[PDB]
Amino acid sequence: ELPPRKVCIVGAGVSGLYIAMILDDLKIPNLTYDIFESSSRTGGRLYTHHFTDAKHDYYDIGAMRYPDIPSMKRTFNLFKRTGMPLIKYYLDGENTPQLYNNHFFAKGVVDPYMVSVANGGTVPDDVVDSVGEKLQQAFGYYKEKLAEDFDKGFDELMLVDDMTTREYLKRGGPKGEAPKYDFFAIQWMETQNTGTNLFDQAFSESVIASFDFDNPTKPEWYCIEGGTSLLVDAMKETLVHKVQNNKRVEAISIDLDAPDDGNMSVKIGGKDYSGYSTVFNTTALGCLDRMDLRGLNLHPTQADAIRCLHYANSTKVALKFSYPWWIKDCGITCGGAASTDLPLRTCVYPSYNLGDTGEAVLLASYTWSQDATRIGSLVKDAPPQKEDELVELILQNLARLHAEHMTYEKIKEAYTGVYHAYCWANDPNVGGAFALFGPGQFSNLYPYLMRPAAGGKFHIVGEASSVHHAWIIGSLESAYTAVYQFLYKYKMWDYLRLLLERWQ
Amino acid sequence: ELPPRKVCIVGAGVSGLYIAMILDDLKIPNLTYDIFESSSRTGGRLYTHHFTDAKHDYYDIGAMRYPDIPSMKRTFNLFKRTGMPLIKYYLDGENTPQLYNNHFFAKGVVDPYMVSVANGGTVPDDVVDSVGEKLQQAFGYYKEKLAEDFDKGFDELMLVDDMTTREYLKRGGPKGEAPKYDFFAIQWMETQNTGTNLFDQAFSESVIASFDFDNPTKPEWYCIEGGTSLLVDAMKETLVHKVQNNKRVEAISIDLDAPDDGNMSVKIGGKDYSGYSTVFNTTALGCLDRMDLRGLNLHPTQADAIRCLHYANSTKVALKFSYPWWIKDCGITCGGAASTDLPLRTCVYPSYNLGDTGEAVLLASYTWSQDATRIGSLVKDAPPQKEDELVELILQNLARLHAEHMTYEKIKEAYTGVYHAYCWANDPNVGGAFALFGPGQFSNLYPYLMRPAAGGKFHIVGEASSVHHAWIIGSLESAYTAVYQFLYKYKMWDYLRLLLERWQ
Numbered sequence A, B: 001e002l003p004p005r006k007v008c009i010v011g012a013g014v015s016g017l018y019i020a021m022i023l024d025d026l027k028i029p030n031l032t033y034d035i036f037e038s039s040s041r042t043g044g045r046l047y048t049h050h051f052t053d054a055k056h057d058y059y060d061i062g063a064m065r066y067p068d069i070p071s072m073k074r075t076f077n078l079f080k081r082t083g084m085p086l087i088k089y090y091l092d093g094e095n096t097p098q099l100y101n102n103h104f105f106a107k108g109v110v111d112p113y114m115v116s117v118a119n120g121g122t123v124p125d126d127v128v129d130s131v132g133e134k135l136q137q138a139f140g141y142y143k144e145k146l147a148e149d150f151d152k153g154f155d156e157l158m159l160v161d162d163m164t165t166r167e168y169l170k171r172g173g174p175k176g177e178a179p180k181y182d183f184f185a186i187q188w189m190e191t192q193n194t195g196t197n198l199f200d201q202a203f204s205e206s207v208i209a210s211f212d213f214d215n216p217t218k219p220e221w222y223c224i225e226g227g228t229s230l231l232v233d234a235m236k237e238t239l240v241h242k243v244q245n246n247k248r249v250e251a252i253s254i255d256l257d258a259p260d261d262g263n264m265s266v267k268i269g270g271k272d273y274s275g276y277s278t279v280f281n282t283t284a285l286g287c288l289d290r291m292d293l294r295g296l297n298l299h300p301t302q303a304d305a306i307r308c309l310h311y312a313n314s315t316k317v318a319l320k321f322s323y324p325w326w327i328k329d330c331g332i333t334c335g336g337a338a339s340t341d342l343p344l345r346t347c348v349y350p351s352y353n354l355g356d357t358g359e360a361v362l363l364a365s366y367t368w369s370q371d372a373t374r375i376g377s378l379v380k381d382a383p384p385q386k387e388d389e390l391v392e393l394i395l396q397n398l399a400r401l402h403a404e405h406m407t408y409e410k411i412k413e414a415y416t417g418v419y420h421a422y423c424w425a426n427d428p429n430v431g432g433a434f435a436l437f438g439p440g441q442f443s444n445l446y447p448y449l450m451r452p453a454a455g456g457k458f459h460i461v462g463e464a465s466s467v468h469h470a471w472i473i474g475s476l477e478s479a480y481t482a483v484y485q486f487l488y489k490y491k492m493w494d495y496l497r498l499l500l501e502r503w504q
């Protein structure tokens, strides 16, 4: 009795696969879909790089770690539904070094990095050792509201969304009744908390990032043993209609003079694909902006949101060593991460090879923003044919960062000559790592990004289309909400009730 | 009687070549220098790409245009000293289209782009047509102070340097007595004035940019016939000591226990080069941050400036056509530029091929910031080889932007299949296009960047080391100031007096 209908899913990241997974589970009679993926690869920002097929010879280029907090239960539900082999992830480990101003951190010492005014620096003495307390004071009220109810705490956070993190810290909040900090105190707080320049983005983003990385529930963290791409594999195998790779959508349109439900079309390589009742676009917004969307007649501020919503860059560099020297020689036995102001910024010790004593991968450099753009400028699609500036830079920084136990020569001799790096802003299928909004964008541009378009038949889906940026959870919520709206638009009340019964 | 001395110049851009030109002209007895260039190319961000040896078959990847205003007289003096063939450059031309929200601009039309509140958009009615007036009111006081005396106007501008452009517009200046604007008005001003997200950088940078591109003196603009690289060529030939290419410095140091003047050294590819009495680093700050600078004992805030001073990205795309269809079919006969919210953002019509009737180059895309990062994600150093997504995107955008007189088919027909593109953040020898400081950086971090180091023997030189970012003038001022300090440091009063006499 339900008429035949076809929907189009643009992009086969976790968002589009989740839409397909929900539709497949609902089994709506005479409903079909097409998934078009621009890349020859499926998975998007779920991307494990395997150095061999040996058990632990990999690293995750995209998503890799997941906190067990209530706001991410849909992600863990997806893990359980697919049989993902989860293991513990150590956000903090043992003996992980911290190196700033060429000094190592030491507990119970005043200004161990020698950056305070008292030791010839410009960081105020009352700030240099108290970045944790002072940011917890700036973020904590909003963080606990988000712990009660995320949507409600987000709505209250939006009342100060016009401010950057720096502007909030400089002026003492929205009416000056919080502590006010000078430039260098804010500069030190950013250096100790996030990537270079990121306090010049939205205050609300810094709050939510601290909520996810420093949650008040003090959560357990998890990784997928074997790499996150195992999740992509599992979602691929269940698909009723398989992904069509090497199909880049360059135009999306609706024919408003046609009476049928299936009056939407996409253009791929100059050829029309029509007959769609709804199009789900799941790409990053930069890819969407490059399409010809005139046939959708989008609201001008919705088009503005696609162009202007800010993305942060990110770069990862992973090196293979003949043995885990950080474990055996430095005593770094349970993961964690080493932070520094040296160019590599963050060195992540894998949680998934703690028992291995042979070949081991180190995530030697993990950067955001300008740090990632600078490292990324050394990352090529065809690495040079000993002469690699990036390798040499990483080995030198690793030696300085682990100087308490290692030499440059010992680290260099342990290096096998095999490495991989990836800069997400250089990926043509994303154009960045993830949404990280500027001041006022969440409260002003974001609502127009989600506004109904094409008479409720076009949906902009993905991590940037949610309140949970740079996490899998944002992709899943966005995709679920868009399926809701699709079922609502066509008054499929039986299956809408089933969607809420099964997937809410 | 002057003892033998040797100085090191790191980098052979216009900064490094200007230091050598000044030293060559002073002819200081027994003074020599080394200039090391990491690239196999000399010139840095002076970089003309030649599509053949044909006369006008080129475009400038880096610097290309020069306003004849008093604060850039040193640049124009370098042009005359080197006999550069200057021709007029047309910043504004005739019949250049402007395309926003799929509508073309027309003077005297109220809200031609249909973005105002009255027409379904969110841009306030009183802002939509008066962006130039309202930005002139926000920038104008400081622009005229900069026109009287640049350094005095700069010093006064620094008293509001804590604010971003957006923040100045939102709060009505530093005490709320200027007009206050809501998010969408500021958003439209940014869209009409500069690159995506740049109003979230320093207010002082938006003032200085307006001062240079929209100077109160209404100046003549110039370009170098044959491309800017002719300047690099002329500076190279006069060199007493030739540039040593493929010499990447990775460490700079001074041995303070040594009594000699020549107690500084640099490391290149693991090898030591010593004997230097002064080291001029002229690299972009990202390249400086990658070096091992411990042997210099830099002030911690100076190191912070090196790492955190913000750079903007920039991407250029140039296409060759079999005839200048923008001249012949669209009436765009006098250079100028076309602006749009489409991904190409800005289409620059060359001023050096206005009389040609055959093959002609178009600078089809010129972008900054996130616009440039997005276009740059399609720019590969090994071009794809008809499958080129970037080419097709440019052709489609060019057709929509020139739809009043051209079709996609005719533009594609005229395209020869020869194009070149460049994204400066992907260049390992820069890591960006140019300094574009964030809020508070000019007044807080920049003074420590210029602070005396290694007892007055180490200098950080280049466009980022000046009050004139993204211009050749900043590079020359910075190099001149560094030569001054070198002569002062060694008490060479005769030659310091000669520097003032010849080079001020």
Ligand SMILES: Cc1cc2nc3c(=O)[nH]c(=O)nc-3n(C[C@H](O)[C@H](O)[C@H](O)COP(=O)(O)OP(=O)(O)OC[C@H]3O[C@@H](n4cnc5c(N)ncnc54)[C@H](O)[C@@H]3O)c2cc1C
Residues within 6 Å of the ligand: A010, A011, A012, A013, A014, A015, A016, A036, A037, A038, A039, A042, A043, A044, A045, A046, A061, A062, A063, A064, A065, A066, A247, A248, A249, A250, A282, A283, A284, A287, A314, A315, A424, A429, A430, A432, A433, A434, A461, A462, A463, A464, A469, A470, A471, A472, A473, A474, A475
């Ligand atoms: C460096 C990094 C680390 C991360 N770490 C974590 C982590 O630890 N934990 C976590 O939970 N999350 C993490 N994330 C976030 C997570 O990876 C993403 O939020 C999620 O994978 C986004 O999926 P998506 O489907 O929304 O978008 P995408 O993964 O980008 O999928 C969109 C797809 O559309 C395709 N496409 C693009 N253009 C077109 C076109 N024109 N036509 C057709 N298809 C097109 C793309 O190729 C892509 O496959 C990380 C992200 C990054 C960048």
Ligand SMILES: Cc1cc2nc3c(=O)[nH]c(=O)nc-3n(C[C@H](O)[C@H](O)[C@H](O)COP(=O)(O)OP(=O)(O)OC[C@H]3O[C@@H](n4cnc5c(N)ncnc54)[C@H](O)[C@@H]3O)c2cc1C
Residues within 6 Å of the ligand: B010, B011, B012, B013, B014, B015, B016, B036, B037, B038, B039, B042, B043, B044, B045, B046, B061, B062, B063, B064, B065, B066, B247, B248, B249, B250, B282, B283, B284, B287, B288, B314, B315, B424, B429, B430, B432, B433, B434, B461, B462, B463, B464, B469, B470, B471, B472, B473, B474, B475
């Ligand atoms: C897209 C763009 C457009 C521009 N347009 C204009 C314009 O119209 N007008 C204008 O006046 N200005 C313009 N500029 C600015 C102008 O190009 C620059 O200000 C100037 O060229 C910079 O000169 P520099 O010597 O300070 O730096 P650079 O040109 O960067 O010189 C530094 C040199 O150091 C080298 N180097 C780097 N690392 C090392 C190392 N470790 N060891 C040794 N050498 C190293 C680099 O290869 C480079 O040659 C533009 C800039 C850009 C990016």
